PDB file of C-alpha atoms and ligand atoms in Angstrom:
ATOM      1  CA  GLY A  24     241.275 -41.660 -52.558  1.00 44.27           C
ATOM      2  CA  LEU A  25     241.304 -39.218 -55.452  1.00 42.56           C
ATOM      3  CA  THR A  26     243.891 -39.543 -58.179  1.00 43.16           C
ATOM      4  CA  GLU A  27     246.294 -36.685 -58.832  1.00 45.11           C
ATOM      5  CA  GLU A  28     244.387 -35.787 -62.003  1.00 46.55           C
ATOM      6  CA  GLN A  29     241.133 -35.687 -60.026  1.00 48.42           C
ATOM      7  CA  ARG A  30     242.585 -33.524 -57.244  1.00 49.43           C
ATOM      8  CA  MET A  31     243.979 -31.150 -59.870  1.00 49.72           C
ATOM      9  CA  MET A  32     240.584 -31.067 -61.595  1.00 48.81           C
ATOM     10  CA  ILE A  33     238.832 -29.981 -58.392  1.00 49.38           C
ATOM     11  CA  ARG A  34     241.592 -27.443 -57.712  1.00 44.62           C
ATOM     12  CA  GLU A  35     241.074 -25.655 -61.033  1.00 40.13           C
ATOM     13  CA  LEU A  36     237.283 -25.595 -60.674  1.00 36.96           C
ATOM     14  CA  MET A  37     237.486 -24.242 -57.116  1.00 36.10           C
ATOM     15  CA  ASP A  38     240.065 -21.732 -58.353  1.00 33.08           C
ATOM     16  CA  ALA A  39     237.705 -20.563 -61.110  1.00 36.46           C
ATOM     17  CA  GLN A  40     234.790 -20.338 -58.661  1.00 37.89           C
ATOM     18  CA  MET A  41     236.792 -18.275 -56.155  1.00 40.13           C
ATOM     19  CA  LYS A  42     237.879 -15.837 -58.882  1.00 44.34           C
ATOM     20  CA  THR A  43     234.511 -15.322 -60.578  1.00 45.01           C
ATOM     21  CA  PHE A  44     231.741 -15.734 -57.963  1.00 44.98           C
ATOM     22  CA  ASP A  45     231.256 -12.490 -56.002  1.00 43.61           C
ATOM     23  CA  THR A  46     229.438 -14.067 -53.066  1.00 45.72           C
ATOM     24  CA  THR A  47     228.808 -10.665 -51.448  1.00 44.30           C
ATOM     25  CA  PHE A  48     227.470  -9.165 -54.719  1.00 46.81           C
ATOM     26  CA  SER A  49     229.596  -6.095 -53.972  1.00 46.95           C
ATOM     27  CA  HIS A  50     229.976  -5.249 -57.680  1.00 48.04           C
ATOM     28  CA  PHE A  51     226.273  -5.597 -58.541  1.00 48.44           C
ATOM     29  CA  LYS A  52     225.434  -1.904 -58.869  1.00 51.35           C
ATOM     30  CA  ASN A  53     223.412   0.612 -60.897  1.00 53.11           C
ATOM     31  CA  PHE A  54     220.553  -1.877 -61.292  1.00 50.83           C
ATOM     32  CA  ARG A  55     216.987  -0.841 -62.044  1.00 50.54           C
ATOM     33  CA  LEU A  56     214.257  -1.074 -59.409  1.00 49.03           C
ATOM     34  CA  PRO A  57     210.444  -1.213 -59.558  1.00 54.36           C
ATOM     35  CA  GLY A  58     208.962   2.258 -59.917  1.00 52.70           C
ATOM     36  CA  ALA A  78     194.923 -12.382 -75.943  1.00 51.01           C
ATOM     37  CA  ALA A  79     195.336 -16.010 -74.937  1.00 52.31           C
ATOM     38  CA  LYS A  80     199.027 -15.075 -75.105  1.00 50.99           C
ATOM     39  CA  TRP A  81     198.655 -12.347 -72.476  1.00 51.46           C
ATOM     40  CA  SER A  82     196.569 -14.956 -70.651  1.00 53.93           C
ATOM     41  CA  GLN A  83     199.411 -17.484 -70.824  1.00 52.32           C
ATOM     42  CA  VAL A  84     201.934 -14.713 -70.137  1.00 54.58           C
ATOM     43  CA  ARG A  85     199.859 -13.811 -67.077  1.00 53.19           C
ATOM     44  CA  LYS A  86     200.107 -17.452 -66.003  1.00 54.15           C
ATOM     45  CA  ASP A  87     203.822 -17.293 -66.827  1.00 54.55           C
ATOM     46  CA  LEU A  88     204.400 -14.148 -64.750  1.00 54.57           C
ATOM     47  CA  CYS A  89     203.317 -15.450 -61.335  1.00 54.57           C
ATOM     48  CA  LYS A  92     206.198 -13.766 -55.664  1.00 56.77           C
ATOM     49  CA  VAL A  93     209.128 -12.266 -53.749  1.00 57.69           C
ATOM     50  CA  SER A  94     209.800  -9.189 -51.642  1.00 57.95           C
ATOM     51  CA  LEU A  95     213.020  -7.224 -52.126  1.00 59.66           C
ATOM     52  CA  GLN A  96     215.182  -5.739 -49.371  1.00 59.90           C
ATOM     53  CA  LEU A  97     218.107  -3.340 -49.827  1.00 58.54           C
ATOM     54  CA  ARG A  98     220.311  -2.662 -46.796  1.00 64.43           C
ATOM     55  CA  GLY A  99     222.241   0.587 -47.037  1.00 64.10           C
ATOM     56  CA  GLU A 100     225.815   0.921 -45.837  1.00 67.47           C
ATOM     57  CA  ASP A 101     224.572   3.441 -43.262  1.00 69.70           C
ATOM     58  CA  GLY A 102     222.066   0.918 -41.883  1.00 66.24           C
ATOM     59  CA  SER A 103     218.951   2.100 -43.714  1.00 65.28           C
ATOM     60  CA  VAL A 104     216.605  -0.509 -45.194  1.00 64.62           C
ATOM     61  CA  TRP A 105     214.330  -0.353 -48.245  1.00 62.03           C
ATOM     62  CA  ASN A 106     211.665  -3.031 -48.745  1.00 60.15           C
ATOM     63  CA  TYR A 107     209.436  -3.657 -51.763  1.00 62.20           C
ATOM     64  CA  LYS A 108     206.255  -5.734 -51.688  1.00 56.76           C
ATOM     65  CA  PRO A 109     204.774  -6.518 -55.114  1.00 56.57           C
ATOM     66  CA  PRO A 110     201.233  -5.941 -56.450  1.00 55.00           C
ATOM     67  CA  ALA A 111     198.421  -8.303 -57.476  1.00 53.07           C
ATOM     68  CA  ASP A 112     196.643  -8.969 -60.795  1.00 52.47           C
ATOM     69  CA  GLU A 117     201.222  -4.146 -63.857  1.00 53.10           C
ATOM     70  CA  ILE A 118     202.978  -7.508 -63.484  1.00 51.88           C
ATOM     71  CA  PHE A 119     205.903  -6.154 -65.539  1.00 53.15           C
ATOM     72  CA  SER A 120     207.331  -3.804 -62.889  1.00 53.78           C
ATOM     73  CA  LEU A 121     209.825  -6.498 -61.812  1.00 56.09           C
ATOM     74  CA  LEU A 122     211.406  -7.458 -65.173  1.00 53.71           C
ATOM     75  CA  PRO A 123     214.006  -4.644 -65.518  1.00 53.47           C
ATOM     76  CA  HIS A 124     215.502  -5.506 -62.117  1.00 55.61           C
ATOM     77  CA  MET A 125     215.377  -9.236 -62.847  1.00 58.44           C
ATOM     78  CA  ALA A 126     217.116  -8.657 -66.183  1.00 57.51           C
ATOM     79  CA  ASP A 127     219.877  -6.685 -64.453  1.00 58.90           C
ATOM     80  CA  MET A 128     220.422  -9.398 -61.833  1.00 57.18           C
ATOM     81  CA  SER A 129     220.377 -12.133 -64.479  1.00 55.68           C
ATOM     82  CA  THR A 130     222.867 -10.158 -66.585  1.00 57.73           C
ATOM     83  CA  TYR A 131     225.197  -9.699 -63.607  1.00 58.17           C
ATOM     84  CA  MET A 132     225.077 -13.418 -62.816  1.00 57.26           C
ATOM     85  CA  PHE A 133     225.530 -14.376 -66.475  1.00 55.03           C
ATOM     86  CA  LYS A 134     228.738 -12.326 -66.595  1.00 55.51           C
ATOM     87  CA  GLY A 135     230.123 -14.240 -63.619  1.00 53.75           C
ATOM     88  CA  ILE A 136     229.169 -17.575 -65.179  1.00 55.98           C
ATOM     89  CA  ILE A 137     230.899 -16.630 -68.434  1.00 56.63           C
ATOM     90  CA  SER A 138     234.047 -15.583 -66.562  1.00 56.63           C
ATOM     91  CA  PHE A 139     233.900 -18.876 -64.652  1.00 57.54           C
ATOM     92  CA  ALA A 140     233.952 -20.878 -67.890  1.00 58.73           C
ATOM     93  CA  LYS A 141     236.758 -18.888 -69.516  1.00 56.53           C
ATOM     94  CA  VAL A 142     239.153 -19.638 -66.645  1.00 53.17           C
ATOM     95  CA  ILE A 143     238.604 -23.403 -66.935  1.00 56.75           C
ATOM     96  CA  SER A 144     241.343 -24.890 -69.098  1.00 57.30           C
ATOM     97  CA  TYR A 145     239.118 -27.657 -70.475  1.00 58.07           C
ATOM     98  CA  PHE A 146     236.626 -24.997 -71.579  1.00 57.74           C
ATOM     99  CA  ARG A 147     239.001 -22.576 -73.309  1.00 58.68           C
ATOM    100  CA  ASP A 148     240.618 -25.453 -75.223  1.00 57.18           C
ATOM    101  CA  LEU A 149     237.284 -26.114 -76.934  1.00 54.99           C
ATOM    102  CA  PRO A 150     236.583 -24.329 -80.236  1.00 56.05           C
ATOM    103  CA  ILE A 151     234.970 -20.927 -79.766  1.00 56.66           C
ATOM    104  CA  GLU A 152     231.740 -22.076 -81.431  1.00 53.61           C
ATOM    105  CA  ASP A 153     231.322 -24.892 -78.900  1.00 51.71           C
ATOM    106  CA  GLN A 154     232.153 -22.531 -76.027  1.00 51.40           C
ATOM    107  CA  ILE A 155     229.269 -20.318 -77.154  1.00 51.70           C
ATOM    108  CA  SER A 156     226.973 -23.322 -77.611  1.00 54.77           C
ATOM    109  CA  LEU A 157     227.737 -24.670 -74.130  1.00 55.61           C
ATOM    110  CA  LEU A 158     227.303 -21.276 -72.457  1.00 52.61           C
ATOM    111  CA  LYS A 159     223.983 -20.699 -74.232  1.00 50.90           C
ATOM    112  CA  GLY A 160     222.732 -24.050 -72.960  1.00 49.51           C
ATOM    113  CA  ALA A 161     224.018 -23.935 -69.385  1.00 49.40           C
ATOM    114  CA  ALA A 162     224.161 -20.266 -68.302  1.00 51.12           C
ATOM    115  CA  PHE A 163     220.772 -20.413 -66.572  1.00 51.55           C
ATOM    116  CA  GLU A 164     221.555 -23.699 -64.811  1.00 52.25           C
ATOM    117  CA  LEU A 165     224.885 -22.491 -63.415  1.00 56.95           C
ATOM    118  CA  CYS A 166     223.205 -19.289 -62.220  1.00 58.59           C
ATOM    119  CA  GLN A 167     220.618 -21.266 -60.246  1.00 54.47           C
ATOM    120  CA  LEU A 168     223.340 -23.493 -58.784  1.00 51.80           C
ATOM    121  CA  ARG A 169     225.200 -20.406 -57.566  1.00 51.49           C
ATOM    122  CA  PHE A 170     221.946 -18.955 -56.209  1.00 50.60           C
ATOM    123  CA  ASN A 171     221.333 -22.112 -54.166  1.00 54.33           C
ATOM    124  CA  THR A 172     224.531 -21.485 -52.192  1.00 52.55           C
ATOM    125  CA  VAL A 173     223.059 -18.177 -50.961  1.00 49.11           C
ATOM    126  CA  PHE A 174     219.597 -19.675 -50.397  1.00 52.13           C
ATOM    127  CA  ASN A 175     218.352 -19.801 -46.798  1.00 52.30           C
ATOM    128  CA  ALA A 176     215.840 -22.634 -46.458  1.00 53.30           C
ATOM    129  CA  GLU A 177     214.929 -21.718 -42.867  1.00 49.89           C
ATOM    130  CA  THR A 178     213.808 -18.203 -43.857  1.00 47.22           C
ATOM    131  CA  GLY A 179     213.004 -18.796 -47.539  1.00 46.22           C
ATOM    132  CA  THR A 180     215.325 -16.012 -48.701  1.00 47.37           C
ATOM    133  CA  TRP A 181     218.201 -15.637 -51.152  1.00 50.67           C
ATOM    134  CA  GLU A 182     220.817 -13.519 -49.354  1.00 49.98           C
ATOM    135  CA  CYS A 183     222.712 -11.615 -52.055  1.00 50.99           C
ATOM    136  CA  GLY A 184     224.816  -9.325 -49.891  1.00 51.51           C
ATOM    137  CA  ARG A 185     222.858  -6.148 -49.201  1.00 53.09           C
ATOM    138  CA  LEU A 186     220.061  -7.468 -51.445  1.00 50.08           C
ATOM    139  CA  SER A 187     217.550 -10.045 -50.242  1.00 48.83           C
ATOM    140  CA  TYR A 188     214.778 -11.837 -52.128  1.00 43.99           C
ATOM    141  CA  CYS A 189     212.227 -13.197 -49.643  1.00 47.00           C
ATOM    142  CA  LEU A 190     209.325 -15.507 -50.448  1.00 48.79           C
ATOM    143  CA  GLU A 191     206.044 -13.961 -49.327  1.00 48.50           C
ATOM    144  CA  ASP A 192     203.534 -15.796 -47.143  1.00 47.25           C
ATOM    145  CA  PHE A 197     202.437 -22.934 -47.749  1.00 46.50           C
ATOM    146  CA  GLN A 198     202.990 -26.430 -49.116  1.00 46.35           C
ATOM    147  CA  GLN A 199     201.405 -25.024 -52.289  1.00 49.45           C
ATOM    148  CA  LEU A 200     204.434 -22.754 -52.727  1.00 47.22           C
ATOM    149  CA  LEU A 201     206.787 -25.739 -53.001  1.00 46.32           C
ATOM    150  CA  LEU A 202     204.672 -26.899 -55.956  1.00 43.61           C
ATOM    151  CA  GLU A 203     206.617 -24.335 -57.993  1.00 41.26           C
ATOM    152  CA  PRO A 204     209.413 -26.393 -59.607  1.00 44.48           C
ATOM    153  CA  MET A 205     212.200 -23.831 -59.154  1.00 46.36           C
ATOM    154  CA  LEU A 206     211.337 -23.324 -55.479  1.00 48.65           C
ATOM    155  CA  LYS A 207     211.132 -27.101 -55.031  1.00 48.69           C
ATOM    156  CA  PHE A 208     214.560 -27.431 -56.664  1.00 48.96           C
ATOM    157  CA  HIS A 209     216.198 -24.979 -54.261  1.00 48.40           C
ATOM    158  CA  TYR A 210     214.693 -26.602 -51.164  1.00 48.65           C
ATOM    159  CA  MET A 211     215.636 -30.118 -52.287  1.00 47.72           C
ATOM    160  CA  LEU A 212     219.186 -29.190 -53.320  1.00 48.41           C
ATOM    161  CA  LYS A 213     219.791 -27.306 -50.065  1.00 51.36           C
ATOM    162  CA  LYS A 214     218.674 -30.365 -48.089  1.00 53.09           C
ATOM    163  CA  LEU A 215     221.585 -32.352 -49.559  1.00 52.35           C
ATOM    164  CA  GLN A 216     224.101 -30.297 -47.511  1.00 52.53           C
ATOM    165  CA  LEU A 217     226.605 -30.096 -50.356  1.00 51.23           C
ATOM    166  CA  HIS A 218     230.206 -28.956 -50.052  1.00 50.24           C
ATOM    167  CA  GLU A 219     231.694 -26.134 -52.106  1.00 48.47           C
ATOM    168  CA  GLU A 220     233.574 -28.765 -54.123  1.00 50.45           C
ATOM    169  CA  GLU A 221     230.376 -30.642 -54.969  1.00 48.30           C
ATOM    170  CA  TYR A 222     228.665 -27.445 -56.160  1.00 47.96           C
ATOM    171  CA  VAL A 223     231.461 -26.523 -58.572  1.00 45.68           C
ATOM    172  CA  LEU A 224     231.494 -30.078 -59.945  1.00 45.67           C
ATOM    173  CA  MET A 225     227.759 -29.802 -60.592  1.00 45.76           C
ATOM    174  CA  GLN A 226     228.515 -26.556 -62.427  1.00 41.34           C
ATOM    175  CA  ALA A 227     231.122 -28.314 -64.580  1.00 39.01           C
ATOM    176  CA  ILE A 228     228.844 -31.269 -65.367  1.00 36.28           C
ATOM    177  CA  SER A 229     226.080 -28.870 -66.408  1.00 35.93           C
ATOM    178  CA  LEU A 230     228.481 -26.713 -68.434  1.00 37.00           C
ATOM    179  CA  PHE A 231     229.990 -29.632 -70.376  1.00 34.31           C
ATOM    180  CA  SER A 232     226.718 -31.131 -71.593  1.00 37.16           C
ATOM    181  CA  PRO A 233     227.525 -32.720 -74.990  1.00 35.52           C
ATOM    182  CA  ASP A 234     223.888 -32.541 -76.157  1.00 36.93           C
ATOM    183  CA  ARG A 235     223.301 -28.789 -76.142  1.00 35.90           C
ATOM    184  CA  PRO A 236     222.080 -27.451 -79.509  1.00 32.17           C
ATOM    185  CA  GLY A 237     224.895 -26.680 -81.921  1.00 33.19           C
ATOM    186  CA  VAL A 238     227.717 -28.524 -80.141  1.00 32.42           C
ATOM    187  CA  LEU A 239     230.261 -29.906 -82.622  1.00 33.86           C
ATOM    188  CA  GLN A 240     232.919 -31.574 -80.429  1.00 32.68           C
ATOM    189  CA  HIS A 241     230.208 -33.743 -78.891  1.00 30.31           C
ATOM    190  CA  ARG A 242     232.677 -36.593 -78.339  1.00 32.31           C
ATOM    191  CA  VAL A 243     235.251 -34.388 -76.589  1.00 32.73           C
ATOM    192  CA  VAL A 244     232.625 -32.683 -74.414  1.00 32.91           C
ATOM    193  CA  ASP A 245     231.098 -36.053 -73.505  1.00 32.28           C
ATOM    194  CA  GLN A 246     234.437 -37.451 -72.328  1.00 34.07           C
ATOM    195  CA  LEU A 247     235.052 -34.271 -70.326  1.00 34.66           C
ATOM    196  CA  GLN A 248     231.608 -34.512 -68.714  1.00 35.19           C
ATOM    197  CA  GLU A 249     232.159 -38.180 -67.866  1.00 32.86           C
ATOM    198  CA  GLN A 250     235.404 -37.349 -66.059  1.00 29.87           C
ATOM    199  CA  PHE A 251     233.790 -34.531 -64.069  1.00 35.45           C
ATOM    200  CA  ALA A 252     231.059 -36.957 -62.983  1.00 35.53           C
ATOM    201  CA  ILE A 253     233.602 -39.656 -62.096  1.00 35.57           C
ATOM    202  CA  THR A 254     235.518 -37.105 -60.015  1.00 36.82           C
ATOM    203  CA  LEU A 255     232.304 -36.182 -58.188  1.00 39.33           C
ATOM    204  CA  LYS A 256     231.458 -39.850 -57.585  1.00 40.11           C
ATOM    205  CA  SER A 257     234.957 -40.453 -56.220  1.00 41.99           C
ATOM    206  CA  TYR A 258     234.891 -37.311 -54.055  1.00 38.37           C
ATOM    207  CA  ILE A 259     231.627 -38.371 -52.401  1.00 40.92           C
ATOM    208  CA  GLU A 260     232.843 -41.923 -51.764  1.00 40.21           C
ATOM    209  CA  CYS A 261     236.106 -40.663 -50.247  1.00 42.79           C
ATOM    210  CA  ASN A 262     234.621 -37.922 -48.049  1.00 41.80           C
ATOM    211  CA  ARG A 263     231.043 -38.923 -47.060  1.00 41.57           C
ATOM    212  CA  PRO A 264     230.660 -42.330 -45.382  1.00 42.45           C
ATOM    213  CA  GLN A 265     227.534 -41.451 -43.387  1.00 46.06           C
ATOM    214  CA  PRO A 266     224.272 -43.328 -44.095  1.00 49.65           C
ATOM    215  CA  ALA A 267     222.576 -39.999 -44.857  1.00 49.06           C
ATOM    216  CA  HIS A 268     224.830 -39.699 -47.929  1.00 48.21           C
ATOM    217  CA  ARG A 269     224.087 -43.115 -49.408  1.00 47.50           C
ATOM    218  CA  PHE A 270     223.123 -42.670 -53.081  1.00 48.80           C
ATOM    219  CA  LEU A 271     224.166 -38.999 -52.882  1.00 47.75           C
ATOM    220  CA  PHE A 272     225.896 -39.056 -56.275  1.00 47.30           C
ATOM    221  CA  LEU A 273     222.752 -40.393 -57.947  1.00 48.70           C
ATOM    222  CA  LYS A 274     220.597 -37.838 -56.118  1.00 49.93           C
ATOM    223  CA  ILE A 275     222.843 -35.049 -57.426  1.00 50.96           C
ATOM    224  CA  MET A 276     222.708 -36.405 -60.981  1.00 50.53           C
ATOM    225  CA  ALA A 277     218.912 -36.533 -60.696  1.00 48.99           C
ATOM    226  CA  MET A 278     218.857 -32.887 -59.579  1.00 46.59           C
ATOM    227  CA  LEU A 279     220.867 -31.894 -62.658  1.00 45.94           C
ATOM    228  CA  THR A 280     218.337 -33.620 -64.919  1.00 45.09           C
ATOM    229  CA  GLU A 281     215.524 -31.753 -63.159  1.00 44.44           C
ATOM    230  CA  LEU A 282     217.435 -28.467 -63.422  1.00 44.78           C
ATOM    231  CA  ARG A 283     217.797 -28.982 -67.175  1.00 40.84           C
ATOM    232  CA  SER A 284     214.052 -29.607 -67.475  1.00 42.80           C
ATOM    233  CA  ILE A 285     213.425 -26.455 -65.428  1.00 42.96           C
ATOM    234  CA  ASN A 286     215.814 -24.623 -67.767  1.00 40.52           C
ATOM    235  CA  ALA A 287     213.809 -25.659 -70.834  1.00 41.01           C
ATOM    236  CA  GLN A 288     210.448 -24.634 -69.365  1.00 41.42           C
ATOM    237  CA  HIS A 289     211.792 -21.310 -68.075  1.00 41.96           C
ATOM    238  CA  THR A 290     213.426 -20.407 -71.398  1.00 39.04           C
ATOM    239  CA  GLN A 291     210.088 -20.823 -73.188  1.00 35.41           C
ATOM    240  CA  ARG A 292     208.436 -18.748 -70.452  1.00 35.30           C
ATOM    241  CA  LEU A 293     210.886 -15.875 -70.908  1.00 35.86           C
ATOM    242  CA  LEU A 294     210.584 -15.953 -74.703  1.00 37.78           C
ATOM    243  CA  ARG A 295     206.795 -15.640 -74.478  1.00 34.19           C
ATOM    244  CA  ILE A 296     207.132 -12.655 -72.130  1.00 37.20           C
ATOM    245  CA  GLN A 297     209.854 -11.093 -74.300  1.00 39.24           C
ATOM    246  CA  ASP A 298     207.464 -11.393 -77.250  1.00 39.62           C
ATOM    247  CA  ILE A 299     204.779  -9.404 -75.398  1.00 39.50           C
ATOM    248  CA  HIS A 300     206.907  -7.037 -73.290  1.00 40.20           C
ATOM    249  CA  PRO A 301     210.600  -6.618 -74.188  1.00 41.08           C
ATOM    250  CA  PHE A 302     213.018  -6.743 -71.264  1.00 40.14           C
ATOM    251  CA  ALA A 303     216.020  -8.848 -72.281  1.00 40.37           C
ATOM    252  CA  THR A 304     219.337  -7.020 -72.009  1.00 38.44           C
ATOM    253  CA  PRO A 305     221.790  -7.283 -74.935  1.00 41.80           C
ATOM    254  CA  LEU A 306     223.685 -10.059 -73.126  1.00 41.21           C
ATOM    255  CA  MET A 307     220.522 -12.083 -72.480  1.00 41.33           C
ATOM    256  CA  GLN A 308     219.530 -11.579 -76.124  1.00 46.06           C
ATOM    257  CA  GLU A 309     222.898 -13.026 -77.158  1.00 45.64           C
ATOM    258  CA  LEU A 310     222.412 -16.028 -74.866  1.00 47.02           C
ATOM    259  CA  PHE A 311     218.866 -16.516 -76.203  1.00 47.36           C
ATOM    260  CA  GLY A 312     219.967 -16.181 -79.828  1.00 47.12           C
ATOM    261  CA  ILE A 313     217.836 -13.083 -80.426  1.00 44.88           C
ATOM    262  CA  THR A 314     219.274 -11.290 -83.454  1.00 45.62           C
ATOM    263  CA  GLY A 315     217.683  -7.843 -83.105  1.00 46.38           C
ATOM    264  CA  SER A 316     215.896  -7.824 -86.471  1.00 48.61           C
TER     265      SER A 316
HETATM  266  C1  LIG B   1     216.022 -12.725 -62.075  1.00 46.55           C
HETATM  267  C2  LIG B   1     215.455 -13.074 -60.730  1.00 46.55           C
HETATM  268  C3  LIG B   1     215.902 -12.470 -59.643  1.00 46.55           C
HETATM  269  C4  LIG B   1     215.577 -12.901 -58.237  1.00 46.55           C
HETATM  270  C5  LIG B   1     215.928 -14.374 -57.930  1.00 46.55           C
HETATM  271  C6  LIG B   1     217.341 -14.657 -58.454  1.00 46.55           C
HETATM  272  C7  LIG B   1     215.850 -14.720 -56.439  1.00 46.55           C
HETATM  273  C8  LIG B   1     216.010 -16.245 -56.443  1.00 46.55           C
HETATM  274  C9  LIG B   1     215.242 -16.751 -57.668  1.00 46.55           C
HETATM  275  O1  LIG B   1     216.134 -17.563 -58.436  1.00 46.55           O
HETATM  276  C10 LIG B   1     214.067 -17.612 -57.163  1.00 46.55           C
HETATM  277  C11 LIG B   1     212.701 -17.000 -57.466  1.00 46.55           C
HETATM  278  C12 LIG B   1     214.132 -19.042 -57.677  1.00 46.55           C
HETATM  279  C13 LIG B   1     214.902 -15.407 -58.466  1.00 46.55           C
HETATM  280  C14 LIG B   1     214.860 -15.492 -59.997  1.00 46.55           C
HETATM  281  O2  LIG B   1     213.850 -16.490 -60.324  1.00 46.55           O
HETATM  282  C15 LIG B   1     214.097 -17.302 -61.366  1.00 46.55           C
HETATM  283  O3  LIG B   1     215.077 -17.217 -62.061  1.00 46.55           O
HETATM  284  C16 LIG B   1     213.016 -18.304 -61.554  1.00 46.55           C
HETATM  285  C17 LIG B   1     211.902 -18.313 -60.719  1.00 46.55           C
HETATM  286  C18 LIG B   1     210.912 -19.263 -60.879  1.00 46.55           C
HETATM  287  C19 LIG B   1     211.015 -20.222 -61.873  1.00 46.55           C
HETATM  288  O4  LIG B   1     210.051 -21.172 -62.020  1.00 46.55           O
HETATM  289  C20 LIG B   1     212.124 -20.220 -62.712  1.00 46.55           C
HETATM  290  C21 LIG B   1     213.111 -19.268 -62.550  1.00 46.55           C
HETATM  291  C22 LIG B   1     214.458 -14.195 -60.693  1.00 46.55           C
END
């Protein structure tokens, strides 16, 4: 029961996702690997995942992290974040509604939503039965707990996975997050707001036309609630990373650009 405009809208988003989301991570290469009240808070900020690399020959490398030193993981994390940020940026540039915005609003929207779209893409490779993010030959496993789900990002991934979303519903979440009219520095707030409203209406219509089961009652509102939580997680995590960056630099040039770090 979608209109022609709504079907075309989903087609372009799915087209952009297919072109820019390397679900096997085959082109993620050459990445680095692990070899006073601020440092206190940064110690609280720092804290748990094992890393597995499966070679093409069949060999396997595993890394288990240390206690307390806590910075051995940041270069790899920066490289993964940078790789995912590049895919998110390519995703936005293909979308016609995005590249018709002025370049200053494109930058403002990408600065505000890059993290959120990365986590949404990571949820599609999350395995809730094994607690692992399967990124091709890379795997990030949660180490051995109802106390673990207290962590808001982990709780997000478990709750979003439980909703059993389609590929089309994920890319519409990505569009709704991307076209947030209230990111800092957005000028065409009225245009972005009307674009966001139409992406949300398309999602609402898609769910009503394709999910009649009682388990999917209120699904649209559950998804919208997840996006609000993801934005709150985004804000807390950005302040976490900026405190760590202040104590121990790690941000790549691309992450610096997205964080507004000038280099002086
Ligand atoms: C750059 C990273 C690489 C490994 C991944 C992508 C594996 C999955 C991950 O998103 C997961 C710890 C949520 C993690 C990333 O974790 C986060 O981005 C994160 C973790 C906890 C939070 O409270 C917020 C963000 C870290």
